[PDB]
Design a protein around this ligand. Structure first.
Ligand SMILES: CC(C)CCC[C@@H](C)[C@H]1CC[C@H]2[C@@H]3CC=C4C[C@@H](OC(=O)CCC(=O)O)CC[C@]4(C)[C@H]3CC[C@]12C
Ligand SMILES: CC(C)CCC[C@@H](C)[C@H]1CC[C@H]2[C@@H]3CC=C4C[C@@H](OC(=O)CCC(=O)O)CC[C@]4(C)[C@H]3CC[C@]12C
Ligand SMILES: CC(C)CCC[C@@H](C)[C@H]1CC[C@H]2[C@@H]3CC=C4C[C@@H](OC(=O)CCC(=O)O)CC[C@]4(C)[C@H]3CC[C@]12C
Ligand SMILES: CC(C)CCC[C@@H](C)[C@H]1CC[C@H]2[C@@H]3CC=C4C[C@@H](OC(=O)CCC(=O)O)CC[C@]4(C)[C@H]3CC[C@]12C
Ligand SMILES: CC(C)CCC[C@@H](C)[C@H]1CC[C@H]2[C@@H]3CC=C4C[C@@H](OC(=O)CCC(=O)O)CC[C@]4(C)[C@H]3CC[C@]12C
Ligand SMILES: CC(C)CCC[C@@H](C)[C@H]1CC[C@H]2[C@@H]3CC=C4C[C@@H](OC(=O)CCC(=O)O)CC[C@]4(C)[C@H]3CC[C@]12C
Ligand SMILES: CC(C)CCC[C@@H](C)[C@H]1CC[C@H]2[C@@H]3CC=C4C[C@@H](OC(=O)CCC(=O)O)CC[C@]4(C)[C@H]3CC[C@]12C
Ligand SMILES: CC(C)CCC[C@@H](C)[C@H]1CC[C@H]2[C@@H]3CC=C4C[C@@H](OC(=O)CCC(=O)O)CC[C@]4(C)[C@H]3CC[C@]12C
Ligand SMILES: CC(C)CCC[C@@H](C)[C@H]1CC[C@H]2[C@@H]3CC=C4C[C@@H](OC(=O)CCC(=O)O)CC[C@]4(C)[C@H]3CC[C@]12C
Ligand SMILES: CC(C)CCC[C@@H](C)[C@H]1CC[C@H]2[C@@H]3CC=C4C[C@@H](OC(=O)CCC(=O)O)CC[C@]4(C)[C@H]3CC[C@]12C
Lengths: 385, 141, 110, 140, 71
């Protein structure tokens, strides 16, 4: 631990942006300011730098309570079990690309280390452009991110050539040295488009799509007749109990088949789509036919769909990555389809309120219904996605 | 004789052949829609050459943005205002707008865009050949 | 895929029943994380691990073989050699000229 | 059987798939405009199958150069030499605006995008159709 | 066809097989990759043999100088 702190606190070698990153996270933690010119940078300070660069719900081993206890109790227990991970993170941060490539060869979790280094090097490239630093630093950090991304793609090629099944276990197993994450998740957080679009990741995503179902023949039709006819579920070949258990947090055969069918992502998608088509077909009927003073049965089902969708979008805001409520709202509105969803639900609210009054507000309520039905056909392109 | 208009003219002469193949396919589709429309909407007709004219007349102008909107689905079999009684509907007159829709889709969307693709992907060879042929025919001129 | 894996099982209308369980569960389990991983056992974790080292060695080795099979490098590494024989054969030529002169003088003495 | 018409016919059969995807997207946009126009311009309607016909009737012929100019923005809500033009339905000014958006999207976006997907897949389809026709000469 | 034409067809077929196979071998042996590879290997052997020639020539020149000293 003490030798690695001496490595992080060196003044030799090439220039770096690590001192600016430590300064920003001490300003965020204790709003002080500029660090003293003699501030020994602890590994707790390095772990907080990894937090701001990774983003999301990451939790580095430095900031956990096990490491903070030892650090106070000491400043082979002080030896690192996997030292080349620490040398990778160190060589990435002060921008030593040739040493980082050497440390990717030696050690292990190369697929994890290359995706972590890709997400790190992209993050300090954005941070250097944000603080108006030298633009040559931001270009070279983007070049280091592209090199580590290209290393992860070419390693994924080699695993897929050797053994197809062991490549999926490489992509999905829990990474205990990287906040219990997944090699599939780390590519997504790094926004690495070539990794996910590779064929090995695509068949992995297809296996995740079917859930606990073998099937894979004449896709779509077999799960539609499963949804409409519940006794058509039992006549389909299900997947074995320990074939590929992607699990979240670790008469009787008939009930297990029903529960495994209704929890598959392809079955949940087709049940969502058939509910949306039935809703849209009802919402055609209530604007084409005239409406009375009170809503009909078909209009009440439509109003119930807008309310349950609005509650569902509210739950998606609450059950998200950040902690602050304004941060949860902001990250939910980066998606453009979530912005137009909230606008259209608010227009249905004011249109239904106007419709429930008398004339001439009932005619104003119908006009907002007709503008809303323009939107719900356009959102039917999400199903086509 | 002009350096730019001459190659353009022999290029038009080259796209004659792709137009002729388009005209053959369009003639088949046009002739099918015209025969079907005329035979459905006019059941009791004597042998006359006006039937052959009515095969080709309005389906040909439907390609160029004139769909004859007053005659797509004429209202019939009812009374519309003095009260006027409209003539009764010939059997299967609802088929004519449906095959009109299929015909208009096939011709204007499929065949014209396909001819755009044929004209476009054979442009470069025809352009180089026509430029060299014009430079050769300068001597004959 | 991960959005539809997280969505309640019931559709928007029947999502009211699902949200009821969700809050009933909140008002129950409390009164009483994201992603689809694989949670490997330590034995298959090692087998996955050595699989990754066979791949990382085979990638680096291959890159080196495709570098040397490169016509571009079969030409560079030829030139270096050619020069080292060019100075060495010139030294052979000068030394053998001296050897012939010494042999001719030895024959004249004999 | 002809050496040029045969590849042309199977080439048309190949572009039918791109045409079908255009038909699906155009069906979505066409139905949205037709339902909005019919539901705004006719507020008091009984349940009848003519509503489903009026969804598809006029917006389909808008694609082929017939905009039905007499019914775009009919003069309404005033006297005019003297008859009384009928009173104006609420929101009737929305119909030319969504008409403008629909005509732009249809005639400018989707037809030109289909031109692009016909053009950029022409060479592969042409070579495959030539080879497939030369293969099917034996069966003929 | 008749048996004798079967014989001519088979002989023609063997001629075509030999033509295709050894023109494939000639196309492989005259390519830039194969020519440059063969030149590389032959130059490796040439440099090793010439280094051995250098050592033996130095030894023989020293022996001839000693023989001239003896005379
Ligand atoms: C699975 C997906 C593809 C479709 C699921 C939805 C359909 C089964 C629904 C949606 C629209 C519904 C129609 C909407 C309106 C009506 C009018 C309704 O008649 C009345 O309201 C007046 C007479 C009466 O009160 O019975 C009779 C049912 C019906 C045809 C409904 C039948 C069932 C439909 C087709
Ligand atoms: C989950 C949602 C989005 C789709 C569900 C599809 C069907 C299960 C729904 C859609 C349309 C519904 C129909 C819409 C209208 C009516 C008329 C309704 O007639 C009356 O209520 C007449 C008596 C009265 O006026 O009270 C009886 C139910 C029924 C057939 C409904 C039965 C259930 C249907 C078929
Ligand atoms: C007023 C109405 C009847 C329209 C008239 C249409 C046709 C009678 C004209 C219009 C354009 C003409 C074409 C324009 C260009 C050419 C190229 C030119 O031919 C060449 O230069 C020979 C080399 C070659 O064909 O490439 C003269 C014939 C042709 C096919 C012309 C043939 C007659 C066309 C089809
Ligand atoms: C497949 C495409 C590229 C070409 C096929 C269309 C033509 C062969 C058609 C379309 C319009 C037709 C013309 C439309 C009208 C007439 C008028 C007609 O004359 C009369 O009817 C006499 C005067 C009268 O009775 O009013 C003679 C046929 C003609 C020239 C038709 C000839 C055939 C034409 C040119
Ligand atoms: C594959 C494609 C090219 C076939 C196209 C077929 C039609 C365009 C032709 C074939 C037979 C023709 C018919 C043959 C005979 C007659 C009778 C003819 O009668 C008269 O001229 C009146 C006789 C008299 O009173 O003297 C009128 C045209 C008509 C219906 C013709 C109309 C056009 C037809 C249907
Ligand atoms: C094959 C491609 C490349 C060229 C297109 C050729 C045909 C489709 C054209 C050429 C001559 C045309 C014919 C020329 C003259 C007449 C007479 C015309 O008779 C009348 O109009 C009678 C008067 C009336 O009653 O209106 C009906 C169309 C017809 C058969 C035309 C039908 C279409 C034809 C066969
Ligand atoms: C009278 C009105 C309703 C117009 C009729 C429209 C359709 C019934 C026709 C017009 C163009 C036809 C198409 C033209 C070309 C072909 C290719 C040909 O298919 C093949 O040669 C098989 C190989 C392949 O599809 O590539 C026959 C079917 C198809 C799709 C045809 C199917 C029937 C279509 C859509
Ligand atoms: C998205 C695009 C590529 C295709 C979508 C358009 C078609 C599905 C629509 C456009 C025109 C429609 C037709 C317009 C008129 C009629 C007549 C109608 O019959 C009547 O109204 C009876 C007679 C009368 O009342 O006058 C039956 C439906 C039909 C064929 C319609 C069927 C559906 C059509 C073909
Ligand atoms: C995503 C897209 C494809 C959805 C498109 C839906 C509409 C085109 C459909 C769905 C429900 C249909 C309605 C369902 C039931 C009826 C009742 C029906 O009434 C009668 O037939 C009269 C009853 C009698 O007197 O017997 C007239 C058609 C109508 C309004 C239908 C019109 C067309 C609608 C709106
Ligand atoms: C999905 C793509 C590839 C193909 C397009 C399919 C639909 C858009 C078509 C096919 C069948 C059509 C239906 C066929 C028959 C009718 C009856 C028709 O009824 C009348 O016209 C009643 C008479 C009147 O009062 O005018 C109204 C249109 C409708 C629902 C059509 C609406 C458009 C539909 C659903």
């Amino acid at each position: 631990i003490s030798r690695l702190e001496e490595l992080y606190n060196t003044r030799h070698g090439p220039s770096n942006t690590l001192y600016h990153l430590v300064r920003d996270v001490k300003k965020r933690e204790y709003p002080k300011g500029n660090l003293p010119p003699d501030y020994r940078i602890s590994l707790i300070d390095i772990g907080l730098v990894i937090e701001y660069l990774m983003g999301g719900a990451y939790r580095c081993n430095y900031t956990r309570k096990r490491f903070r206890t030892l650090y106070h109790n000491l400043f082979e227990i002080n030896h690192f079990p996997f030292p080349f991970h620490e040398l990778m993170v160190w060589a990435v941060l002060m921008k030593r690309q040739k040493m980082a490539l050497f440390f990717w060869q030696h050690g292990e979790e190369a697929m994890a280390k290359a995706l972590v280094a890709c997400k790190l090097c992209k993050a300090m490239a954005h941070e250097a452009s944000e603080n108006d630093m030298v633009d040559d630093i931001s270009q070279e950090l983007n070049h280091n991110s592209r090199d580590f991304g290209q290393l992860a793609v070419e390693l994924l090629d080699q695993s897929y050539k050797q053994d197809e099944q062991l490549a999926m276990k490489l992509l999905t197993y829990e990474l205990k040295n990287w906040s219990n994450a997944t090699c599939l998740q780390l590519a997504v957080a790094a926004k690495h488009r070539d990794f996910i679009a590779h064929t090995c990741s695509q068949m992995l995503l297809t296996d995740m799509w079917m859930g606990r179902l073998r099937m894979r023949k004449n896709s779509g039709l077999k799960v539609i007749l499963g949804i409409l006819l519940p006794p058509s579920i039992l006549s389909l070949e299900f997947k074995n109990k320990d074939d590929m258990p992607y699990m979240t947090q670790a008469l009787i055969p008939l009930g297990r088949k029903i529960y495994e069918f209704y929890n598959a992502p392809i079955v949940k998608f087709w049940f969502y789509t058939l509910a949306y088509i039935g809703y849209l077909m009802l919402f055609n009927y209530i604007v084409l036919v005239k409406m009375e003073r009170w809503p009909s049965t078909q209009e009440w089902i439509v109003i119930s769909y807008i309310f349950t969708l609005g509650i569902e979008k509210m739950r998606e805001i609450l059950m998200s990555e950040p902690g602050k409520l304004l941060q949860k709202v902001k990250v939910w509105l980066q998606e453009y389809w979530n912005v137009t969803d909230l606008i259209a639900i608010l227009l249905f609210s004011v249109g239904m309120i106007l419709r429930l009054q008398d004339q001439p507000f009932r005619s104003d309520g119908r006009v907002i219904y007709c503008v809303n039905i323009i939107y719900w056909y356009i959102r039917l392109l999400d199903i086509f996605g | 004789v002009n350096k730019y208009l001459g190659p353009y003219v022999m290029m038009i002469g080259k796209m004659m052949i792709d137009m002729m193949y388009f005209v053959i396919i369009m003639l088949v589709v046009l002739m099918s829609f015209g025969v079907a429309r005329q035979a459905i909407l006019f059941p009791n007709e004597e042998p006359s050459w006006k039937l052959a004219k009515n095969i080709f007349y309005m389906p040909y102008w439907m390609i160029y943005g004139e769909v004859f909107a007053d005659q797509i689905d004429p209202p019939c079999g009812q009374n519309e205002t003095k009260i006027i009684q409209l003539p009764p509907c010939k059997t299967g007159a609802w088929i004519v707008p449906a095959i009109m829709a299929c015909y208009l889709l096939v011709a204007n969307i499929l065949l014209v865009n396909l001819l755009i693709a044929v004209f476009n992907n054979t442009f470069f060879e025809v352009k180089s050949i026509s430029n060299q042929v014009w430079k050769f025919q300068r001597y004959q001129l | 895929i991960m959005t539809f894996h997280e969505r309640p099982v019931l559709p928007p209308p029947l999502i009211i029943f699902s949200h009821m369980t969700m809050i009933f569960q909140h008002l129950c389990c409390r009164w009483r994380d994201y992603g689809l991983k694989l949670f490997i056992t330590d034995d298959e974790l090692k087998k996955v691990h050595d699989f990754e080292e066979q791949c990382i060695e085979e990638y680096f080795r291959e890159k080196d073989d495709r570098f040397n099979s490169s016509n571009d490098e079969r030409i560079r590494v030829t030139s270096e050699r050619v020069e080292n024989m060019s100075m060495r054969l010139e030294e052979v030529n000068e030394r053998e000229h001296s050897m012939k002169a010494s042999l001719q003088t030895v024959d004249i003495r004999l």
